[PDB]
DNA sequence: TATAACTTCGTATACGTATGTATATACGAAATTAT
DNA sequence: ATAAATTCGTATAATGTTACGTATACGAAGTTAT
DNA sequence: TATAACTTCGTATACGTATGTATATACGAAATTAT
DNA sequence: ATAAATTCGTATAATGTTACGTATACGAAGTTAT
């Protein structure tokens, strides 16, 4: 089958476009860490031996990696073999048993997921006070971005692809914006998040000083060098990383600067506006389903993960007990 | 396996009544196109070669075929091979991966599934207000049909199968159409579709002027020739092509001829009342479960898909941000 | 494996108590009809050949047997072989294809399930007028039975096992009765259907004239010969058939006597009081779940099969259309 | 397969952390009883013989063991053989049929599963009204525990795992216990159990007098010696046997010693608050979905089972029959 | 000083879930380009 | 002979669950800071 | 008498379900027992 | 040199679907009682 595996790998690469470029990066990252460990421990890297993958998994656990990550590592290895025509490591009792041991142990050892910091109206209003009067182009853009986000529950990559033309005007002195949001045959070509009155005036103060209006193709948000001059572009969009940074920086301008321990989730992030908006919607009392829509959600659970600790979403028992 | 395949193909044909006429229609159709491509490239048409099927699916993609239809061509190919004892083409990395790729590329290219132009309440009320005055048998039938289609959400093939004996009455006086043919197979007696008093009146008027009640085995709907003379029958039933034609004509009767764009769903089709009734219920509250019941749905995707466009925006976060 | 099948059959008979006696009767009935057909057509009866079972199935269809029955026949045959260590007929493509053909055909040929006649308050009140003054012991018992049934949605076999002691008195001048209803670890030891004021007086007029009170063990309902003398017994209960007959007879005393065509479901039956009571509950507007309980129901569907044509359970579309 | 089994058994023991301590506890327990019976009858204990296992299960039945426990003995036997590569006893008609039989015979004999004596609101309010006045640390802990048990419906093992760091507050001031260990495995962060203001006050008072907050890694609940001195710890946690003891003592403190009937659930056990809270919600409306959420249920059987006894009768058909 | 309050234990029995992968966000960090 | 059922055969409607663990129930013996 | 109103057809594409068995009721009919 | 990003690697949270049919969409040719 040495020729069959050869063909299979030729098949995978031939139709690599069958998977996202980022998806491949993930697989490459695993194969990199796995192969390396093998070289350091003297173990055939491909195909992988059950006992080998068992030792490797037990290794990742020590590295302190969460279960979700260890599973992903195994997963990539599994598919790599399945699509290679070879036996998958997860098909061996050794690996199956070790994965169960790790998941159980780690869970009992107190393994908490990763919560995200919330960016609510109280934070958006405090900021809306600090960087609302600044004449700095950077500040004018950051606020606009912080507006669209919170007000549209939009994802980062989504706000990054937004173009000037993608934004229309209607329903009064307010604004309109329609993006993609979804994509696999079944989806909603597009929706139409509409900025409020007190957000459109922030997005206009940005387009006027940025000049993104000099070409409907130009993305709404662009670059802004140290000189304070924007760089409107209809060919390149702001990296999601950059947008994420706008969150961390804003949070820095207010609550100091992160913390020593790399404990992971100290400042605001790409979805700090989504979690926040949802909670704010739940606070004012809004049907969960209604909150589902606002943020293109379809997994009540996830939405219930941001507003659970929300003191209204307390539960029946509490209402029963409290008369 | 070389003659066992012949027998398998023979057993499938013997009990061919096990599959719908449409399945066979598509089967032989796909085989025609696939065999045609094979001929133009001097290749074996059966059994198919995974590499060859890959070239074929990519050929369909090139022809501009939709993703859902490319999958159909693959689906029939898989069936003919599975129901024949041979390995399915999809059992190959080449085919399996190229199908995922084509799906991506196309989707990312903007492609998306289409749905029948909606036929909501306003439409029904408008068409009714225009044809309820006609005494023509054709007009009396088309109006009762559309009323049944909207009210019952039934598909055109089910509506065309309704026999006089199936119709019944209630304690309130409203008709009750019994649908004898459910696809969630077991023994669900069938749904007893109830009509509104106003809609029952429409059907009642048609039955009269049509005299289909001459035989309780007659099909509720029949053809009406030029001289406005009904042609009831208990054997043959109005072709679904005729029912789709009513939807198309009732649309042209109000909006005129459709552009020569060639596009699909430029007018009402056999599913218009379905997608239209679902939205009307959703937009007017109506719990999702009841909606499922109404349209006879056992899932959730489709019902949602037909809506997602109405009460998207308006108020929500905006109203919250303002005051 | 001739010895393995021998052992297996010895296993099945050894632990025959693993199945209900009636369940076995069913299996015997199938094996009887199957073997007979084989003898008449010259075909090995056990083990069964795919083509053989195919011909047999195709035969039952001609006999005019519904799909549910034909499936049962196959089912018994399947298990017989599975538990015999032999291959099941349903495991062959021939039989699998034929079953699909039959189910599809019959369904398209207009195969309606079997509906039961309803015994509602209007029927119970009309009867309560006819046989309420009669001094005949038979009449006094029949009415009492017709009372418990309608008022308790109880099953027949359940009303048959009822004993005098199983009936207590409380909640005023009313009566109380607790039976089994369920039984497989998870269940409700028992419930407690309570007769109304205008039903308890009917059950007492029976116990006083029957004398079932001369032993708490004695079943509530007993025999009543032509002489008009009851036969209280704590060892033997009234056959379900007898109770069913009380339904048919009552229906006879009023709407003539059945009909020529053995069309199956002309008079009332063992559950004519359940279907009726439910509908009556739905009429007065009662939460489906509430109706579920009353009749130990847990399958909303079934309950929705009795009250569907109930003109209140019309649907959303109707409410929408009717303003 | 003769040494492969040894390795399999070796791999299971190596990664024994893959299974719960209770699974292993039951495993070795069942093996003790099974091996004991084998010894008394001069038979091989492993691998087990289907005929021998049959004699064993029937032996348990004879001993009067419950159906659920007989199934446990079969369950462990099956695991030890499957996880060892050998065929499971249940893969035999003898065992499979005898288990169905025993289930029937026992059930039909009247046997039924039992459930913990309920601990509803009235009970909690009563116990509270009696211990809320005590200053003893033991009394202050037991009252906070019962309050947490009722309010949160949490099991005793989860309640015993709660660490101080897990407790948090809300916008209203009510505590929020984070449960870090869910069995519907993926990454459900966990449930954030919210307490009522009144119940939070109870916990707050205990934390104080216990000084467990001395270490946020300390277990919310610890032991309290004779001198009323708390003994916090971040390593060892209050034994579940101790928590069950609180339920038993709080019951004896109100109803005195339980009869020497030997029966189970003669007093409140670790599941009392669970079954008790479920009914309290059901009896007070509360949609089933919310109930599931409260008790952390993902199904429907158990929740229902805990109720079915309340609003059974009363009114319903009776009220309808009367007037 | 015997003792309250558990902890550990073993057999009996009730309670419960049932997916793995492709894709996007996190985010500290190295690379890049224009002030 | 026949009312009133009971027992039978079998079509057909309504009900109900398997597999593999994991956690609680509880009397009894062993532990420990008082 | 050409023609409204379909029917039949074939390729293109959207819509949809996913269980089988053990047990109880049906019910016409033969068997049974006491008036 | 450095603000402002972009590109990279990879831990980790959130999203989403396969298999096998079955039915509709619609322009075009053939059918038939007027």
UniProtKB/Swiss-Prot annotation, chains A, B, C, D:
The active site is at residues 155, 271, 274, 297, 306. Homotetramer when bound to DNA. Gene3D superfamilies: 1.10.150.130, Intergrase catalytic core (1.10.443.10). Residues 1-85 form the Core-binding (CB) domain. GO terms for biological process: DNA integration; DNA recombination. This is Recombinase cre. Residues 112-320 form the Tyr recombinase domain. Keywords: DNA integration, DNA recombination, DNA-binding. One of its GO terms (molecular function) is DNA binding. Catalyzes site-specific recombination between two 34-base-pair LOXP sites. Its role is to maintain the phage genome as a monomeric unit-copy plasmid in the lysogenic state. InterPro entries: CB, DNA_brk_join_enz, Integrase-like_cat_sf, Integrase_catalytic, Integrase_recombinase_N, Phage_Integrase-like_Recomb. Belongs to the 'phage' integrase family. SUPFAM superfamilies: DNA breaking-rejoining enzymes, lambda integrase-like, N-terminal domain.
